[PDB]
Design an enzyme around this catalytic site. Structure first.
Site, PDB file in Angstrom:
ATOM      1  N   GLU A   1     -12.437  11.742   8.777  1.00  0.00           N
ATOM      2  CA  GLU A   1     -11.390  11.350   7.852  1.00  0.00           C
ATOM      3  C   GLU A   1     -10.212  12.321   7.795  1.00  0.00           C
ATOM      4  O   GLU A   1      -9.056  11.894   7.817  1.00  0.00           O
ATOM      5  CB  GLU A   1     -11.941  11.152   6.432  1.00  0.00           C
ATOM      6  CG  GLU A   1     -12.782   9.902   6.212  1.00  0.00           C
ATOM      7  CD  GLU A   1     -12.027   8.577   6.400  1.00  0.00           C
ATOM      8  OE1 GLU A   1     -10.786   8.587   6.599  1.00  0.00           O
ATOM      9  OE2 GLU A   1     -12.686   7.507   6.344  1.00  0.00           O
TER      10      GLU A   1
ATOM     11  N   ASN B   1       0.131   4.479   4.003  1.00  0.00           N
ATOM     12  CA  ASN B   1      -0.129   3.174   4.590  1.00  0.00           C
ATOM     13  C   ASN B   1       1.071   2.308   4.240  1.00  0.00           C
ATOM     14  O   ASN B   1       1.109   1.676   3.188  1.00  0.00           O
ATOM     15  CB  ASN B   1      -1.412   2.600   3.978  1.00  0.00           C
ATOM     16  CG  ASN B   1      -2.609   3.533   4.158  1.00  0.00           C
ATOM     17  OD1 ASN B   1      -3.083   3.749   5.272  1.00  0.00           O
ATOM     18  ND2 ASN B   1      -3.088   4.103   3.060  1.00  0.00           N
TER      19      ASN B   1
ATOM     20  N   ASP C   1       0.792  -1.526   2.972  1.00  0.00           N
ATOM     21  CA  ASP C   1       0.464  -1.948   1.622  1.00  0.00           C
ATOM     22  C   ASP C   1       0.855  -0.950   0.538  1.00  0.00           C
ATOM     23  O   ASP C   1       0.379  -1.032  -0.597  1.00  0.00           O
ATOM     24  CB  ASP C   1      -1.021  -2.318   1.508  1.00  0.00           C
ATOM     25  CG  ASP C   1      -1.917  -1.127   1.243  1.00  0.00           C
ATOM     26  OD1 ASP C   1      -1.696  -0.041   1.818  1.00  0.00           O
ATOM     27  OD2 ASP C   1      -2.853  -1.288   0.436  1.00  0.00           O
TER      28      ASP C   1
ATOM     29  N   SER D   1       0.041   2.170  -0.058  1.00  0.00           N
ATOM     30  CA  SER D   1      -0.979   3.034  -0.632  1.00  0.00           C
ATOM     31  C   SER D   1      -1.010   4.323   0.182  1.00  0.00           C
ATOM     32  O   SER D   1      -0.398   4.396   1.246  1.00  0.00           O
ATOM     33  CB  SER D   1      -2.354   2.340  -0.632  1.00  0.00           C
ATOM     34  OG  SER D   1      -2.929   2.258   0.671  1.00  0.00           O
TER      35      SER D   1
ATOM     36  N   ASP E   1      -3.744   7.711   1.366  1.00  0.00           N
ATOM     37  CA  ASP E   1      -5.099   8.253   1.397  1.00  0.00           C
ATOM     38  C   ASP E   1      -4.970   9.742   1.123  1.00  0.00           C
ATOM     39  O   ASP E   1      -4.146  10.411   1.743  1.00  0.00           O
ATOM     40  CB  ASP E   1      -5.740   8.013   2.759  1.00  0.00           C
ATOM     41  CG  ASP E   1      -5.828   6.546   3.101  1.00  0.00           C
ATOM     42  OD1 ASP E   1      -6.274   5.754   2.255  1.00  0.00           O
ATOM     43  OD2 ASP E   1      -5.426   6.190   4.213  1.00  0.00           O
TER      44      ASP E   1
END
Length: 130
Positions: free
Chosen positions: A35, A46, A49, A51, A53
């Site tokens: 990750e 992202n 959309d 968003s 992480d």
């Protein structure tokens, strides 16, 4: 902070991640590895959309933490996404446990399915004293 392998293994164990909801420490290590490369400051926007992480586990703002700029987002871990960028991973660990209390479990992370599921993850904790 970019954790060294065994340093993270012991840090995760002290935080109670070993076997949490049936998930071995080695699986968690495999998750953090793929990750973020064990980097707590890791971030990925992202654009598709809106968003982002956050941190060592790349937890998404759409459902787990609040960053104030993700549309109709939720904050299931009830934390600012900033809490997921600390060198101290206590909050990121509390949130990762929250993620796995859901039906999918560790499968919540697609990278886990891609790079850890049904694989020999022993190598992640070998020699770490855990």
């Amino acid at each position: 902070k970019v954790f060294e392998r065994c340093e993270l293994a012991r840090t995760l164990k002290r935080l109670g991640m070993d076997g949490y909801r049936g998930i071995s420490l080695a699986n968690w290590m495999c998750l953090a590895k793929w990750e973020s490369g064990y980097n707590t400051r890791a971030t990925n926007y992202n654009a598709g959309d809106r968003s982002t992480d956050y941190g060592i586990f790349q937890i998404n703002s759409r459902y787990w933490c609040n960053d104030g700029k993700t549309p109709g987002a939720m904050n299931a871990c009830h934390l600012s996404c900033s809490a997921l960028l600390q060198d101290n991973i206590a909050d990121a660990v509390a949130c990762a446990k929250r993620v796995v209390r859901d039906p999918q479990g560790i499968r919540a992370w697609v990278a886990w399915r891609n790079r850890c599921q049904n694989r020999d993850v022993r190598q992640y904790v070998q020699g770490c004293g855990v």
